[PDB]
Design a protein around this ligand. Structure first.
Ligand code: VDX
Lengths: 9, 239
């Protein structure tokens, strides 16, 4: 649950 | 001819981007779960891969113009290419005298029998060693190795990529920076660009095999529980 990939922001 | 003021700034940036994201000391390795000599090496190697996935994300963000695609395109290129970048960046620790990646510590020297104890077979590992020995033999300069990674990352022919037109453009802009660099700055590399492009096609074959083998490992809860959240998200089937 909730993509690590905002490690974009 | 020479390299232009703009192509060299691409070179310098890509190089510093690799310097910031690749620790020659390997000192962050003790913070991983230890290596152990079924699948004793999975926790340590899962930790190692999860770490370098974070590094590759950092590298990408500094590639000239990556920071300007759709966040979705960024993630699609990063997910689909991460394992190839990792195979690429790892050549920096692959010594041919030892046919292993020696990482500044004997607890961190990974021979082929180590990676079998993390789930993978020779159908992957032997093409992989041959890739690294072929790539090490090309005695690349730093700017070539780093350019090769950025060109690998910026392929527009990966699942999920939307603005193919533009990803194509920036990758082409780096292919030509690279190709100029080899022509102008590398004595005796009259064929070398072509050797590097073949290495990209190698990477796709191994990506395919890893994917196949990873999927088998990740579908058993026994072993998926030993992976990390970042590894499961990136090498995972979820769109
Ligand atoms: C990572 C890096 C290094 C080695 C890469 C290796 C060595 C061990 C075995 C590896 C990790 C391969 C394994 C098949 C990866 C399997 C991943 C998993 C078990 C989760 O499915 C791929 C690259 C190989 C060390 C240093 O170069 C940092 C770099 O960045």
């Amino acid at each position: 649950r909730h993509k690590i990939x905002x490690x974009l922001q | 001819h020479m390299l232009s003021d703009e192509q060299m700034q691409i070179i310098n940036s890509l190089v510093e981007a690799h310097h910031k994201t690749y620790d020659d000391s390997y000192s962050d390795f003790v913070r991983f779960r230890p290596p152990v000599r079924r699948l004793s090496m999975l926790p340590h190697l899962a930790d190692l891969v999860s770490y370098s996935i974070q590094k590759v994300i950092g590298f990408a963000k500094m590639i000239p113009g990556f920071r300007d695609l759709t966040a979705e395109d960024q993630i699609a290129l990063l997910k689909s290419s991460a394992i190839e970048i990792i195979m690429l960046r790892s050549n920096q620790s692959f010594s041919l005298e030892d046919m292993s990646w020696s990482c500044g510590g004997p607890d961190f020297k990974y021979c082929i029998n180590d990676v079998t104890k993390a789930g993978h077979t020779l159908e992957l590992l032997e093409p992989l060693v041959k890739f690294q020995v072929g790539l090490k033999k090309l005695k690349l300069h730093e700017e070539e190795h780093v350019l090769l990674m950025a060109i690998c990352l910026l392929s527009p022919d990966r699942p999920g990529v939307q603005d193919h037109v533009r990803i194509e453009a920036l990758q082409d802009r780096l292919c030509d920076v690279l190709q100029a660099y080899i022509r102008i700055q590398h004595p005796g590399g009259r064929l070398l660009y072509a050797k590097m492009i073949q290495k990209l096609a190698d990477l796709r074959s191994l990506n395919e095999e890893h994917s196949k083998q990873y999927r088998s490992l990740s579908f058993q809860p026994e072993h998926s529980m030993q992976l990390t959240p970042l590894v499961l998200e990136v090498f995972g089937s979820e769109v």
